[PDB]
């Protein structure tokens, strides 16, 4: 399934050549795959989730995305759009108040609830978690990605947009989930993006254009936007069956993109959200 005028990250994870408009990917879009998606949660009215999104918790007085931050990267999971795995389904866990912070304390706990509200909900193909948060270091933070890495979830956390080595932000220092650079659309690395030997994958987070909320798009950049990318597409695969959810961080890392990216630092590795669609 090709999808002409495709977001320029969309369409580079569906090909080794950057500058492409084309998404192609397998008819299946990831259906069957649960992504829990943990930021300002989600406006799961969006006509572009197509009733896919849903709010399932929230850590604050409301359930809505007062923000965007939450429905742009929901959106770039699997939204029909801008999603890359679009026809997953989508929950909202609303961690993070309307505009951007919220305490360690919730993130974690935001986290644990993930764990064990999978338990109880129809995800045959797999769990998924797209991370697109990151504060400093904590070992509680990575203990809880780690907790929710090894209870059966695919934890697809951000590098950080600081320029530095990850290892010293949470949970994107965490060893078992897959932390995520940004690249941009001439295939270099994000000027943001931090690198370092942790990080397990890029993927495109410049001018990445989703969803957002009032029903509209938006255009905004950073590795929580390359996040989401590879938390669809880890459901992509995993719905395709190809790989397994506690596996499919290095599935991506070893069917990706080699030796394609500018300017990563000599220890970081120099991969690329590939999805393999051989059409």
Known sequence: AAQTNAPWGLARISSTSPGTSTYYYDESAGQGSCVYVIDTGIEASHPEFEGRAQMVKTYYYSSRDGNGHGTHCAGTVGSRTYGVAKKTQLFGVKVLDDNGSGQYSTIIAGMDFVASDKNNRNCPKGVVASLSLGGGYSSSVNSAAARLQSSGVMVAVAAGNNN????????????????????????????????????????????????????????????????????????????????????????????????????????????????????
């Open 164 to 279: 530095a080595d990850a290892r010293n932000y949470s949970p994107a220092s965490e060893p078992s989930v897959c932390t995520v650079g940004a690249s941009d659309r001439y295939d270099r690395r994000s000027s943001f993006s931090n690198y370092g030997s942790v990080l397990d994958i890029f993927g495109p987070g410049t001018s990445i254009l989703s969803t957002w909320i009032g029903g509209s798009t938006r255009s905004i950049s950073g590795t929580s936007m390359a996040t989401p990318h590879v938390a669809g597409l880890a459901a992509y695969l995993m719905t395709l069956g190809k790989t397994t959810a506690a596996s499919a961080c290095r599935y991506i890392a070893d069917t990706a993109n080699k030796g394609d990216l500018s300017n990563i630092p000599f220890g970081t590795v120099n991969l690329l959200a590939y999805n393999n669609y051989q059409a």
